[PDB]
Amino acid sequence: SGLVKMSAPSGAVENCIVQVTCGSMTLNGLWLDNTVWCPRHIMCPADQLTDPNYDALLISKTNHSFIVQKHIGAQANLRVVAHSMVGVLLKLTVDVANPSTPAYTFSTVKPGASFSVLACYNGKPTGVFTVNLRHNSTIKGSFLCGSCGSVGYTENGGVINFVYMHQMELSNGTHTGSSFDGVMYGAFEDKQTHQLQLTDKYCTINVVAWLYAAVLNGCKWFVKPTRVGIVTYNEWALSNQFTEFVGTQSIDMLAHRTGVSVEQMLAAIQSLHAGFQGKTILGQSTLEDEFTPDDVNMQVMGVVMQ
Amino acid sequence: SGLVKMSAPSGAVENCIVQVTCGSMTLNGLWLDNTVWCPRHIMCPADQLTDPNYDALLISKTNHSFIVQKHIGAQANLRVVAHSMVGVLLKLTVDVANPSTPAYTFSTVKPGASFSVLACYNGKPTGVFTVNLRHNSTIKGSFLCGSCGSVGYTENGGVINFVYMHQMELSNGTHTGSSFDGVMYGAFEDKQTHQLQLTDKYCTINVVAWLYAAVLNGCKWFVKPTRVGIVTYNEWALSNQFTEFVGTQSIDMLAHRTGVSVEQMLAAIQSLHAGFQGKTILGQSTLEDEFTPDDVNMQVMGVVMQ
Numbered sequence: 372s373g374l375v376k377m378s379a380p381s382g383a384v385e386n387c388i389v390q391v392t393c394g395s396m397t398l399n400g401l402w403l404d405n406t407v408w409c410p411r412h413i414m415c416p417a418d419q420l421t422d423p424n425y426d427a428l429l430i431s432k433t434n435h436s437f438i439v440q441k442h443i444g445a446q447a448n449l450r451v452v453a454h455s456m457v458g459v460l461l462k463l464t465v466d467v468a469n470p471s472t473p474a475y476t477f478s479t480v481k482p483g484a485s486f487s488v489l490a491c492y493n494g495k496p497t498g499v500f501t502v503n504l505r506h507n508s509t510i511k512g513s514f515l516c517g518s519c520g521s522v523g524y525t526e527n528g529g530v531i532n533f534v535y536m537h538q539m540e541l542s543n544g545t546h547t548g549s550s551f552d553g554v555m556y557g558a559f560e561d562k563q564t565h566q567l568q569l570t571d572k573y574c575t576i577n578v579v580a581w582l583y584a585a586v587l588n589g590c591k592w593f594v595k596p597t598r599v600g601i602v603t604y605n606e607w608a609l610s611n612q613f614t615e616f617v618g619t620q621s622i623d624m625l626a627h628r629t630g631v632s633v634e635q636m637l638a639a640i641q642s643l644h645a646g647f648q649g650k651t652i653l654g655q656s657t658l659e660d661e662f663t664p665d666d667v668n669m670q671v672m673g674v675v676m677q
Numbered sequence: 678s679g680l681v682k683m684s685a686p687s688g689a690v691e692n693c694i695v696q697v698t699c700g701s702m703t704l705n706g707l708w709l710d711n712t713v714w715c716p717r718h719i720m721c722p723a724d725q726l727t728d729p730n731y732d733a734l735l736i737s738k739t740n741h742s743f744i745v746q747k748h749i750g751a752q753a754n755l756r757v758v759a760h761s762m763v764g765v766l767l768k769l770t771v772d773v774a775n776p777s778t779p780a781y782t783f784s785t786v787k788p789g790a791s792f793s794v795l796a797c798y799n800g801k802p803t804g805v806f807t808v809n810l811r812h813n814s815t816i817k818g819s820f821l822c823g824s825c826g827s828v829g830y831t832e833n834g835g836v837i838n839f840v841y842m843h844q845m846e847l848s849n850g851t852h853t854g855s856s857f858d859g860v861m862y863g864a865f866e867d868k869q870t871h872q873l874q875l876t877d878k879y880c881t882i883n884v885v886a887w888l889y890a891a892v893l894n895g896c897k898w899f900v901k902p903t904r905v906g907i908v909t910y911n912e913w914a915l916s917n918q919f920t921e922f923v924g925t926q927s928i929d930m931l932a933h934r935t936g937v938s939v940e941q942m943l944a945a946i947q948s949l950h951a952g953f954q955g956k957t958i959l960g961q962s963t964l965e966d967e968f969t970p971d972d973v974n975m976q977v978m979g980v981v982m983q
């Protein structure tokens with residue numbers, strides 16, 4: 372029992388982190404097969420940050436403009452033999468395949484989804500933590516500028532699914548990045564301009580999962596006979612910065628295991644949103660919306676209702 | 678910017694996890710050089726879990742009683758050639774040295790310290806998270822049945838410092854384990870027999886570090902001209918379930934870079950202990966006490982205010 376922010380083990384990803392340097396800019400890259408991925412803003416000099424011409428920058432660089440090095444494990448200096456843009460990513464082809472390339476896929480995650488982040492600095496892994504893609508397609512992580520190129524991923528059946536490369540910090544504690552097809556998460560540009568975020572929202576289904584986790588962990592004071600219809604909840608959600616609720620099988624199974632209905636949990640959200648009455652749930656006095664139903668399922672596996 | 682629960686990257690530790698089976702019981706072990714460590718209660722049948730005679734169990738076991746396998750990476754079946762007891766740990770000697778043994782040390786952390794945990798199941802690493810040793814020397818983690826033998830650790834300069842092997846759950850979300858000298862944290866016993874936990878307390882020095890981290894991240898509404906001297910806060914602490922405050926250099930450094938005095942933070946604590954009055958700090962409406970001053974230093978390295 373217990374519920375904590377848990378990440379996927381980072382070893383397979385650590386084997387792929389490298390340092391990329393272009394001019395006086397340096398950040399992290401991801402080395403898979405004969406390719407190194409890193410944010411394209413590595414090419415942009417500080418004085419062009421507000422209006423970069425990335426097409427111009429790209430072909431103003433030679434291959435030997437890029438220095439790519441692996442600092443950890445089997446160290447190496449890697450020769451770049453081609454460079455091109457993939458959306459807001461720079462794709463460096465190098466002349467040696469990473470012998471430690473894991474089995475991997477690329478995916479783009481949806482708002483509400485969690486993934487693990489390996490934070491890196493200067494081509495060295497420094498920390499691991501888990502984030503959730505926010506309603507406005509940002510994340511709440513912990514990064515420095517040198518952390519650009521840090522990698523988000525999930526893991527299943529020994530396959531690493533790479534889903535995020537860190538690109539920038541928008542506002543205090545608020546970050547975004549791109550998937551590895553080079554599409555930036557959200558409506559964000561890799562420029563130095565004031566950009567406005569769409570308003571964030573609590574992810575309802577994640578809050579519901581969290582409330583089920585709580586009940587399975589013996590915390591159930593917030594459960595009342597009170598229920599609210601899904602249609603009524605969703606109306607209310609529109610005006611109170613919560614996502615619409617749509618049921619899933621895993622939520623139904625958490626309901627079955629606890630004996631607490633989905634409608635009771637949505638009612639509890641409406642009451643709790645108004646205030647926690649000086650009480651806590653799994654140690655918090657605010658709604659937690661970064662646990663998916665799948666994240667919860669992993670940490671309550673085999674846990675029996677009491 | 679941003680402050681999250683960060684763990685040390687797990688790759689170096691993943692390479693040392695194995696599965697240990699003794700009769701009907703299976704759990705995780707840690708393989709370093711020619712040694713495999715695992716909890717000694719692997720020797721105990723479901724029956725005599727109530728009052729095990731570990732000394733008798735030990736002599737009834739032969740080296741062939743113990744099956745040790747590596748299921749990940751370079752797989753391996755390891756032959757046990759000696760076994761001895763080390764407090765609440767079993768120390769198995771195997772005929773093959775782990776080729777991927779990292780540079781390592783052992784240590785025993787003190788209440789208030791943080792460390793990373795690699796949750797394991799059937800000898801397979803499944804997740805990483807960070808915990809904090811509570812005032813009563815328990816940790817608030819997330820552990821399921823076959824997670825015994827899961828490993829806690831910190832990183833010290835290319836050196837893995839092993840500090841914890843998971844032993845048992847005491848109550849919902851409440852766990853303990855041993856250092857690798859085989860001394861149980863909290864002196865709890867590896868018996869069934871329900872044991873009384875000392876009362877937990879908020880770690881004052883960590884709360885203070887968290888408030889500094891808040892101030893360093895633009896959240897500063899709680900700071901008042903109000904001060905309260907250390908001597909006075911400590912008297913108050915004894916009656917309100919906080920640990921007594923003792924100044925350290927890292928705290929001084931943070932007070933220094935914030936311009937906010939320790940006495941001001943202690944004041945905020947007494948006030949915030951009364952209530953957050955509807956407001957939040959770093960998104961929470963409760964006092965966070967699981968970030969050490971060093972943890973915070975790390976995530977505020979190279980950060981200047983507003």
Ligand SMILES: CC(=O)Nc1ccc(N(C(=O)Cn2nnc3ccccc32)[C@@H](C(=O)NC(C)(C)C)c2ccsc2)cc1
Pocket residue numbers: 396412415416417420421514515516517518519538539540541560561562563564678
């Ligand atoms: C030569 C040089 O200085 N290059 C550079 C500068 C800034 C960034 N940005 C980051 O977010 C860098 N970054 N990424 N993670 C960070 C965490 C803390 C601080 C900064 C962080 C973007 C941005 O908007 N930054 C401000 C300062 C306005 C917030 C950006 C992207 C393309 S152009 C500008 C990227 C590259």
Ligand SMILES: CC(=O)Nc1ccc(N(C(=O)Cn2nnc3ccccc32)[C@@H](C(=O)NC(C)(C)C)c2ccsc2)cc1
Pocket residue numbers: 372702718721722723724726820821822824825844845846847866867868869
């Ligand atoms: C064959 C067999 O039954 N083996 C076995 C089972 C359980 C444990 N325990 C764990 O905490 C195992 N453990 N460790 N973390 C857990 C999280 C959830 C559930 C179980 C967990 C202890 C305990 O509390 N057990 C009761 C029965 C009270 C539940 C314990 C420690 C020394 S003696 C007994 C140890 C060995």
